[PDB]
Each structure stands twice: as structure tokens, then as C-alpha cells.
Design an enzyme around this catalytic site. Structure first.
Site, PDB file in Angstrom:
ATOM      1  N   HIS A 243      51.127  66.309  67.376  1.00  0.00           N
ATOM      2  CA  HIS A 243      50.665  67.050  68.548  1.00  0.00           C
ATOM      3  C   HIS A 243      49.391  66.471  69.159  1.00  0.00           C
ATOM      4  CE1 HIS A 243      47.470  69.479  66.747  1.00  0.00           C
ATOM      5  NE2 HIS A 243      48.273  69.797  65.747  1.00  0.00           N
TER       6      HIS A 243
ATOM      7  N   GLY B 100      39.766  71.622  65.838  1.00  0.00           N
ATOM      8  CA  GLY B 100      39.377  70.253  65.524  1.00  0.00           C
ATOM      9  C   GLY B 100      39.713  69.854  64.093  1.00  0.00           C
TER      10      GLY B 100
ATOM     11  N   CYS C  44      42.683  69.879  62.716  1.00  0.00           N
ATOM     12  CA  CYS C  44      44.021  69.313  62.510  1.00  0.00           C
ATOM     13  C   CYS C  44      43.978  67.918  62.001  1.00  0.00           C
ATOM     14  CB  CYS C  44      44.866  69.434  63.757  1.00  0.00           C
ATOM     15  SG  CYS C  44      45.071  71.145  64.298  1.00  0.00           S
TER      16      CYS C  44
HETATM   17  C1  P7R Z   1      42.905  76.226  67.941  1.00  0.00           C
HETATM   18  N1  P7R Z   1      42.492  76.412  66.549  1.00  0.00           N
HETATM   19  C2  P7R Z   1      41.468  77.270  66.179  1.00  0.00           C
HETATM   20  O1  P7R Z   1      40.773  77.932  66.938  1.00  0.00           O
HETATM   21  N2  P7R Z   1      41.406  77.226  64.816  1.00  0.00           N
HETATM   22  C3  P7R Z   1      42.361  76.354  64.322  1.00  0.00           C
HETATM   23  C4  P7R Z   1      42.763  76.031  63.037  1.00  0.00           C
HETATM   24  N3  P7R Z   1      43.837  75.278  62.795  1.00  0.00           N
HETATM   25  C5  P7R Z   1      44.524  74.809  63.846  1.00  0.00           C
HETATM   26  C6  P7R Z   1      44.167  75.018  65.178  1.00  0.00           C
HETATM   27  N4  P7R Z   1      44.983  74.746  66.291  1.00  0.00           N
HETATM   28  C7  P7R Z   1      46.289  75.001  66.463  1.00  0.00           C
HETATM   29  O2  P7R Z   1      46.886  75.850  65.805  1.00  0.00           O
HETATM   30  C8  P7R Z   1      46.918  74.324  67.683  1.00  0.00           C
HETATM   31  C9  P7R Z   1      46.491  75.018  68.992  1.00  0.00           C
HETATM   32  C10 P7R Z   1      47.219  76.327  69.140  1.00  0.00           C
HETATM   33  O3  P7R Z   1      48.658  76.164  69.167  1.00  0.00           O
HETATM   34  C11 P7R Z   1      49.195  75.276  68.266  1.00  0.00           C
HETATM   35  C12 P7R Z   1      50.578  75.304  68.158  1.00  0.00           C
HETATM   36  C13 P7R Z   1      51.216  74.383  67.346  1.00  0.00           C
HETATM   37  C14 P7R Z   1      50.462  73.456  66.658  1.00  0.00           C
HETATM   38 CL1  P7R Z   1      51.258  72.331  65.600  1.00  0.00          CL
HETATM   39  C15 P7R Z   1      49.087  73.422  66.753  1.00  0.00           C
HETATM   40  C16 P7R Z   1      48.427  74.346  67.554  1.00  0.00           C
HETATM   41  C17 P7R Z   1      43.047  75.823  65.405  1.00  0.00           C
END
Ligand code: P7R
Ligand code: P7R
Ligand code: CL
Ligand code: CL
Lengths: 300, 305
Positions: free
Chosen positions: A41, A143, A145
Site C-alpha cells: 500500500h 507511519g 507500517c
Molecule cells: C492511520 N494509522 C493510524 O492512525 N495508526 C495506525 C497504525 N497502524 C496502521 C495505520 N494505518 C492504516 O491502517 C492505513 C490507513 C487507514 O486505512 C488502511 C487500510 C488498509 C491498510 Cl493495509 C492500511 C491502512 C495507522
């Protein structure tokens, strides 16, 4: 003596963390030999995330659209390919700090250390378990990921998790290092939810054995149980079924403490019925389920 | 989201761990620049430990009686001296992996990461707090002596603990890297005990702020209190006194969550007096006191090293 939630030393993994940028998106990558692994992603903008067509988005990228920074050095991307939900960026430099490693896909109940990273820089290390519902209860901000989970039994790093997503309940979903998700999750922003989670019974029993090894026996009782009666009771408290494989795995801890597995099951049944009555076990007022039988033997 | 007991990344410290052998005793040492630091009891037999005269035991050793191994390479010991309860072995090679570091002595309530080691090889990392009774609730087996505790502040490793001993209750005692014990402990096999411990109040409040940040608010209430009334409650429940310095340190978390420090104190007073009533906070049924206010801010902001 003592019993702590202990992570593996993270140095071997710290030396592999890099920052991967594609357009406006920046996350972490894992640099092993001449390949950088990261969540696919990274090629999406927030406007691509409901129904991304990753093959179509990727074919539009050239090697120079991926910026990989290792410390203060930009690596040169010379190839790219997708394997399931991971992107593999071939780079022109093999990581000189590549440890001995393998990729292992784990099962629910297994534990591992997580090296949480931001911008390719490690922030902290903690211990996690793959929940029965295939999520992990991590600590991850935006951040994070691409941060990875691993074990380091005997100098070889076994990478088992790469972080991809946070679910609405604040729990986390990711893949193995071959890019296959744990559980029924997809790397899309479509509505997804963690299923009802349950307690990892075999791990609770391992931790009760750790408490006995460390000198505590208050929770033992004179009773035993059949495996089927134990499962009928434990399921009423949302505990995972205990299988004959789990009973066999607890054999060494049973032999060391002199407490038969089914006798420890009877102790667990009583703890579920009575609670702790103001007492603690290994410094906890709840039954701990993120230590495996292998972790207890390694630590005790 | 999520809140875990998190240690600092240990790599900078892993590159300093060595094995030190003196006679039949093998333990860990910390190799920084051209010196290896380890507990001075590495020179003792079990009988010497009953009542050791360290200066007398040490004068009998030559540099070659200390076998120092860094990975699969033997270092050459070219000098030896004692500083308080630490032995300093001068070696002929500066550690090329010496990070930027300092030696700091911490106060009770402060947390640090421990890199547990055996035979000069790191085995695990975990987060500890220096208890008010100057012990640490570590996880250490025989062979773990010389394992160290540290924090990282920017790119500098601050070493604050070296492991020396396990007490009868299974808790641990050690020194700073200048060899001064934390607590009224001595490096001798003689009757010693951890004193009655207390809960680190400022850390419990920091962890309640972490719970609020993570969406756990059930324990909040409409009440506030005064520092004196709260401290009368803290004394009653074997909690450490909360000072105005602690209140000031919790200022940022108070401003972020909208819960004044004495407003959170009123939540804590109610929790002490009534318990959790079957509920949990951040997955715990006990009030957690091994996260400082700085740890909470760092974890909730994603500071890297
Ligand atoms: C955005 N974010 C946070 O605020 N805390 C996070 C902790 N871990 C991960 C993320 N982000 C995600 O989850 C992103 C953005 C949102 O949508 C999706 C959907 C699918 C996938 Cl594979 C990734 C994501 C985090
Ligand atoms: C022997 N041992 C264990 O079995 N688990 C340990 C965890 N941490 C430390 C040790 N060892 C010690 O405590 C040693 C041996 C016993 O006597 C004393 C007395 C004073 C001092 Cl400074 C050190 C020691 C361990
Ligand atoms: Cl597994
Ligand atoms: Cl602060």
C-alpha cells in the site's frame, strides 16, 4: 527469578530498517540482502485505498519512483515486484548488516517481538502474540507500517509479521514476509472488523506453570478434569479450546513441576470460577496469555 | 493506537556486551572505548562472597586471569582497577561499536530498559522501573550478572544499571556504572532483604493519561482534589507522595486530555478507595506504575532512535 514480558534484543532487526517513500507516502521497509520488503500500500494515496488495483497502480511506477533511505544514504532501486501484499524492491547494495534470517508464518497463540519504527528509525521494542482472531494488540501510530515482528531463537532471525493496518478497535493486522495476511483481512479501507477474540488457553496454562516454577502454588487444587470437561467450562469464559497437541506441548513443564496438565487445567477452571480473591500471579491480577510454553521454558 | 510496555531498541547496547571470566566465574561485561565494566564479585569464589575483601582478592589477580570474549574474539586485558562495586578491565582495543554514551544515576520511579545477557550474549530486553525500595523487578537467572539497564535520549545511550544480585523475594539489586549500589545493599552473601515497597504515584497518573489517550475513560469523574488531600490518600494506600514537581511534569498530558492533574488524582483516589469494580484499564486489573510521564509522551508521539 522474576518473570517479565521479554522481547528479543532488537539490534539484528534495527540494522535492516529503512524508510520507503513512493510519492507522498512514506513507511518502513525491511532491507535483507539486496531486497527491501514493504507493504504494497506504499503505492497508494489515501484516495486509492477503498478498492486499489495494485497491479494497475504498480505497472505505472518506475524504479526511480521508490526512494529508499538507509540511515543518511539513499539506496538505488533497480527492480520491483509484488508478492501477495508485499512489495519487494531490489536495490543495488546488499545490506552489510543482514543477519542470518528466515521467513516463518506463525499460528495464533505464537508470540513475537515487534520493533516499532517510524521513517525507517526504530522507536521501541515490545512483545506481542498473534491473537486467535488473527490480529495483534500492538502499539502503532501513523507511519508504523512496515514495522516487523520476529523471533531470534539461536542467532537466526525468524521474521513473522509485517505491519499493514489498524482496525477500528485499535488492534492491528498484517502479513507474513511473503505478503499473506494473517486472518481474513485485506489491504483496503473497506469496512473490516476484528472477530470476537478469545483467550489463548495453552499460553495461560504455560504461565501458570511459570508461576509454579517461580515458587507460587496458591491456585492449585486437589482436583483434576477430563480434557472435554475442561473445554466445556473454558469455552464459557471465551477461552480457546485446548487440544491434545496443547496437552502434549505442556508435557515438559508438567514433568518439571510435577503437576499433570489436566491437574493444571483444574486449577485454571477454579481461577475462572473464583477470580484471584485479591491475590496476584507473577505480578498480574488477570490471567496472562501472551507467554507460550516455549517462552516459559526459555525464560525460567 | 495501543499501549505496550516498550523497551528502547537494544542494538547500541548489544554491540557492547562481552563475556568476562575469572577462574570458575563467568558473567557479562560492558565494553565501552577501551574498558570493560563488570561486577567486582567476578573475582570471588562462593566462600569469598561470605565476607569479601575485594582489594585483597584483586591484588592476587594478573591481567591474564581475566578472560574477555567479544563475540568469538578474545580481547587482551592490559590493566585492571576497581571503582566502588565495579571492576574496570582496560583492554588493548577500543570497542569500534562504542555508541555515544554517558553514565547516569537514576532516581526511584525512573524506568529503563534491561538487556538480559548470559555468556556475553544478549538474550532478552525488557522495561523495568527502579522501585521506591531501590530494587528492580527483573527477570534474571544465574549468569545474568553484569547485564545492564539503559535509556536512550536522542542518539546517546545513558547507562544507569548493572546487575549484581538477586534478593530472597526474587527481586534484583545492582549498581550504577560507577559501581554505587541502588539501595542499602552490599555485594556480599549475607542476609539482605528488599524493604517494603510503595507504588510510584506519578507513574500511575501518567498511565491513567495513557489510558485516556487510548480511549479508556470509565474512571474519570467530575471531582477534583488538593495536593494535600490527595497525599493523605496516597500515604494511606502505600503510594509515594505526589509533589508539585510531579504535577508540573504531568502538565502536558493534562493539557492534551483536558483532565487536570488533581482531576486525575480524584480519579486515582476513587480507584484506590473502591477498586476497579470488575473493569480493567489498558488491559490491566492493577494500577500500572512502570511508565513515566516521559514514557507515555514518547510512546504516544513515536520518538525514534
Ligand atoms: C492511520 N494509522 C493510524 O492512525 N495508526 C495506525 C497504525 N497502524 C496502521 C495505520 N494505518 C492504516 O491502517 C492505513 C490507513 C487507514 O486505512 C488502511 C487500510 C488498509 C491498510 Cl493495509 C492500511 C491502512 C495507522
Ligand atoms: C545466583 N543467581 C541465581 O540463581 N539467579 C540470579 C539472578 N541474579 C543474580 C544472581 N546471583 C547473585 O545474587 C550472586 C550469587 C549469590 O550471592 C550473591 C551475593 C551478593 C551478590 Cl552482589 C551477588 C550474588 C543469580
Ligand atoms: Cl507458530
Ligand atoms: Cl512531558
Amino acid at each position: 527469578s522474576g518473570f517479565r514480558k521479554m522481547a528479543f534484543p532488537s539490534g539484528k532487526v534495527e540494522g535492516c530498517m529503512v524508510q520507503v517513500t513512493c510519492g507522498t507516502t512514506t513507511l518502513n521497509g525491511l532491507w535483507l540482502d539486496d531486497v527491501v520488503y514493504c507493504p504494497r500500500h506504499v503505492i497508494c494515496t489515501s484516495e486509492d485505498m477503498l478498492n486499489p488495483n495494485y497491479e494497475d497502480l504498480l505497472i505505472r511506477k518506475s524504479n526511480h519512483n521508490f526512494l529508499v533511505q538507509a540511515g543518511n544514504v539513499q539506496l538505488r532501486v533497480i527492480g520491483h515486484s509484488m508478492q501477495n501484499c508485499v512489495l519487494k524492491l531490489k536495490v543495488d547494495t546488499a545490506n552489510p548488516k543482514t543477519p542470518k534470517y528466515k521467513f516463518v508464518r506463525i499460528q495464533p497463540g505464537q508470540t513475537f517481538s515487534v520493533l516499532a519504527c517510524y521513517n525507517g528509525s526504530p522507536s521501541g521494542v515490545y512483545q506481542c502474540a498473534m491473537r486467535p482472531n488473527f490480529t495483534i494488540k500492538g502499539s502503532f501510530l501513523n507511519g508504523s507500517c512496515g514495522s516487523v515482528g520476529f523471533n531470534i531463537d539461536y542467532d537466526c532471525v525468524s521474521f513473522c509479521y509485517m505491519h499493514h493496518m489498524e482496525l477500528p478497535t485499535g488492534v492491528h493486522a498484517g502479513t507474513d514476509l511473503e505478503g499473506n495476511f494473517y486472518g481474513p483481512f485485506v489491504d483496503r479501507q473497506t469496512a473490516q472488523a476484528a472477530g470476537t477474540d478469545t483467550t489463548i488457553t495453552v499460553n495461560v496454562l504455560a504461565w501458570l506453570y511459570a508461576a509454579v516454577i517461580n515458587g507460587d502454588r496458591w491456585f492449585l487444587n486437589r482436583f483434576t478434569t477430563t480434557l472435554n470437561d475442561f473445554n466445556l467450562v473454558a469455552m464459557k469464559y471465551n477461552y480457546e479450546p485446548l487440544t491434545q497437541d496443547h496437552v502434549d506441548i505442556l508435557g515438559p513443564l508438567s514433568a518439571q513441576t510435577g503437576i499433570a496438565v489436566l491437574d493444571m487445567c483444574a486449577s485454571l477452571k477454579e481461577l475462572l470460577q473464583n477470580g484471584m480473591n485479591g491475590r496476584t500471579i507473577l505480578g498480574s491480577a488477570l490471567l496472562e496469555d501472551e507467554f507460550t510454553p516455549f517462552d516459559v521454558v526459555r525464560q525460567c
